[PDB]
Paper text:
Unusually, histones from kinetoplastids are highly divergent. Here, we have biochemically and structurally characterised nucleosome core particles (NCPs) from the kinetoplastid parasite Trypanosoma brucei.
In order to investigate the molecular details of divergence in T. brucei nucleosomes, we determined the structure of T. brucei NCP at a global resolution of 3.3 Å by single particle cryogenic electron microscopy (cryo-EM). The low stability of the NCPs required us to perform mild chemical crosslinking prior to purification and sample preparation. Compared to the H. sapiens NCP, the coin face of the T. brucei NCP exhibits compression along the horizontal axis, with inwards shifts of histone-DNA interactions at super helical locations (SHL) 2 and 6. At SHL2, we observed tighter packing of the α1 helix and loop 1 region (the ‘H3 elbow’) of histone H3 to the α2 helix of H4. This likely occurs due to overall reduction in hydrophobicity and the loss of a bulky aromatic residue (H. sapiens (‘Hs’) Phe78 versus T. brucei (‘Tb’) Gln75) that shifts the α1-helix of H3 inwards towards H4, increasing DNA bending in order to maintain arginine–phosphate interactions. We could reliably model only 126 bp of the 145 bp present, presuming that the missing ends of the DNA are flexibly tethered. The pseudo-symmetry in the T. brucei NCP is broken, with one end of the DNA being considerably more disordered. Electrostatic interactions and the hydrophobic core of the H3–H3 four-helix bundle are disrupted (Hs H3-Ala111, Hs H3-Ala114 and H3-Leu109 to Tb H3-Cys108, Tb H3-Ser111 and Tb H3-Arg106, respectively). A π-stacking network mediated by Hs H2B-Tyr83, H4-Tyr72 and H4-Tyr88 is absent due to the loss of two of the three tyrosines in T. brucei.
Author numbering:
A (entry chain D), H (entry chain H): 19 to 111
B (entry chain F): 24 to 98
C (entry chain E): 45 to 129
D (entry chain C): 15 to 111
E (entry chain A): 39 to 129
F (entry chain B): 24 to 99
G (entry chain G): 14 to 111
DNA sequence: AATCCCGGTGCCGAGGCCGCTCAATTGGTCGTAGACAGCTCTAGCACCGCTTAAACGCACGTACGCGCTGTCCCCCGCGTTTTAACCGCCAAGGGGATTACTCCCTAGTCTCCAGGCACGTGTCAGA
DNA sequence: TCTGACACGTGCCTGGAGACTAGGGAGTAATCCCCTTGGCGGTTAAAACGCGGGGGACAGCGCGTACGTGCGTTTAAGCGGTGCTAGAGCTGTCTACGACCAATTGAGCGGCCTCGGCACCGGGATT
């Protein structure tokens, strides 16, 4: 039997980040898992479309910046791109 | 489609926020619901038939809905 | 008035669950007979069917109240469908 | 993971990179792309859970568990995340009054 | 003669294909909107027309939907509540 | 938006098929037109800025429109 | 006609369709039969649109022999299947159906 | 200057096959060319989604049979699949 | 009172031919992943029975639906005057587009271990 | 308060990670010229304003019927407990074929040319 790949551990850690004693049901865990999956699919598909349009072969951070800019609403997009750039810069050093 | 009773349509309408329902609304709602379910199942059947399987798992229905536009979370 | 708030506050499945299964299997047989289903996919096909009809009826309510009425009529459903596809 | 903690994130950066490769969105996938995707996913998840926690306190009952009804209400109330999720039907969710 | 030139324009401007918005003020509006993001951005002559035609299509569809709602309301005069209803039902 | 004259809104409405137009429709249609154009331009500038270009081309506008589900034909 | 398109009897190019599929990075590998099938589907859809546009041009009072964008728009909007696929699609300088 | 690739010759050949005396303007050429491009992208995106969901790497005829059945309406899709299968059977043998 | 058919035209604008090249086509090798067969046990369909929520048929009132009436001012629609939009033209030059080149960044391989997960259980929300 | 439900302990296993190699491709400099800006003037469609009036928008009134609400009967849904088995999920394997490379070449494209199809405009039919 193949192991099941989900985001339950990371979602639980994210919830513990804000409120430690906060908890969520199994159905809510599936809801957040599906939200993560389809947001990943949306952003990755937008980045792939950008790559195809610009005739490139690399889905890097720059492509994902534009994918996040196009998919997310502007007020949330600003925070999301700021967080992504911060994480990329922190990882590079 | 006639199995979908008047009570279920009335309850869905109450969740939709109406106060009164005409007597002709029920047939139209039954027709729309049957058409929507027919499309969703027609599409999940295509997804299932590609996989060389003869079962419609929740993933297939979710994908069929996602292509249609009405995305679904929790399956 | 009471039932509107009762059903908006509630979150349970509203359509009958066995007649809906019968409708799904009838449609599948109409497409091509012999196809088997999954007990975890009928609920998925129902929670997105009741959501669609609930949204359509809320749009119908908006259309009818916009017309000065409080009762939905087939022309309201037709306007809601024609306005979205 | 080494890169998940090095980047300063809680979401995986190996899972995201492997998922991107397996999706074949592009032939080559940059190493920084996985970090960026993991960061964006983590921020979106954190914002969704922050909205859920905020909206759970406003309930008449001080429930300490996020039922699908509560997260659906939190999504529906917010304008920004609500516009993003304006067409999704959360399983066993509901409609805001 | 209320009810003659109205249908004259309905049949005149529904059989036509040329642009309806005045090109220069729409171009000014597009450039003013773009200036709020990055000043000095340049627009291809074809890109402005491609945006103008899509905006024309969107406004025409929205106004036709609003007219459908107004007719459903038993009127012939479109009002802001009709536009709000059409926008709410569409998205 | 004040450059979007009453005549343009009236012509758009006649093409849409309305008979009579209220005196308040013009302002709301101006608002929705401005919002749509703002969305389209803010979406096309992302494509233009990604490709290191300082010129928003018709392909970028078409892609931006396709993002919103308003696919446009004849500009590519 | 291309050698690998004529052998299949199509009009659209099988080779160029396959090259477009590979350049788009839709999948890691693309079968040879997939390019043929996509070329056939595109050819059929273009042929259907052209047939509908020709019929709509014939339906006009003027016996025009040139396919104006208005004719294509009318043929699309009057059909029940090609007008549902091409919903939310704006034909440039095509106007709207009366 | 790099050569630009369009379906002008192919669309014109299809028109001549449909009716030898017909023609279309340059704008209609662009409309039909963008129609073909949009349908190419829409079918190929669904085929890629099918490949991704079922964890495969080959985009063959079946991945496009199912894509055509998924995207287009039933009556038009039936003819499209019939023509695609006919062409594939012609090419294979 | 307004709206459609057609003759001549000039005015393009789509189609046609020549040179050329980039991409298509062919032959050969090789590795890969897709199709096939078998094992296994999951769950999917079928059935029986209890409880009862729910559907449904009827009686009855009302109150919202629909039509009618009256007003009134909110918009057609016409003429004047303004004015700004459309087009063509001249340059300036910023920047798009193409090519050559460099390196750095990523695919692929090999080896290693630990992060993730499945089961069981420990301990706590809720009706 | 028992019932149900989310999260540690622990071991198991595949994939994340580091080192190394090898090109692929993204980024950059150089260069050319294309297209965008721009501003201007000449023209003429368009609109902004003032105005009269007329006809739909809006509200009140009245009649009625159909929709809701309550009573009472009936129907099958839900579940859930069991039973049988059809087929999904997983593992090996053995090829067909798709990628990649070297060589060949022709189908398509850019440029120049061509010719007739047709949008137009007024004049004469029509509504």
């Amino acid at each position: 039997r193949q192991r099941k790949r989900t985001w339950n551990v990371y979602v639980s850690r994210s919830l513990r980040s804000i409120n430690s004693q906060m908890s969520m049901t199994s159905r809510t865990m599936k809801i957040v898992n599906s939200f993560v999956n389809d947001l990943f699919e949306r952003i990755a598909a937008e980045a792939a479309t950008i790559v195809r349009v610009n005739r490139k072969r690399t889905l890097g951070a720059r492509e994902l910046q534009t994918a996040v800019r196009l998919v997310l609403p502007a007020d949330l997009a600003k925070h999301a791109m700021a967080e992504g750039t911060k994480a990329v810069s922190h990882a590079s050093s | 489609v006639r199995g979908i009773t008047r009570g279920s349509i009335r309850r869905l309408a109450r969740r939709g926020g109406v106060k009164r329902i005409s007597g002709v609304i029920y047939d139209e709602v039954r027709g729309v619901l049957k058409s929507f379910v027919e499309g969703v199942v027609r599409d999940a059947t295509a997804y299932t038939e590609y996989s060389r399987k003869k079962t419609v798992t929740a993933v297939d229905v979710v994908n069929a809905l996602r292509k249609r536009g009405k995305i679904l979370y929790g399956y | 008035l009471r039932e509107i708030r009762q059903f908006q506050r509630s979150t349970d499945l509203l359509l009958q669950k066995a007649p809906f299964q019968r409708l799904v299997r009838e449609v599948s047989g109409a497409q091509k007979e012999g196809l088997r289903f999954q007990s975890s996919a009928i609920l998925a096909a129902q929670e997105a069917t009741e959501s669609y009809i609930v949204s359509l009826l809320a749009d119908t309510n908006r259309a009818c109240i916009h017309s000065g009425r409080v009762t939905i009529q087939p022309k309201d459903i037709h306007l809601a469908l024609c306005l979205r596809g | 993971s080494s890169r998940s903690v090095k980047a300063g994130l809680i979401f995986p950066v190996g899972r995201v990179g492997t998922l991107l490769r397996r999706g074949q969105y592009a032939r080559r996938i940059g190493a920084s792309g996985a970090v960026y995707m993991a960061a964006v996913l983590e921020y979106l998840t954190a914002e969704l859970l922050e909205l859920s926690v905020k909206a759970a306190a406003q309930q008449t009952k001080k429930t300490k568990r996020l039922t699908p009804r509560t997260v659906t209400l939190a999504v529906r109330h917010d304008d920004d995340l609500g516009a993003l999720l304006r067409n999704v039907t959360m399983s066993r969710g509901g409609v805001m009054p």
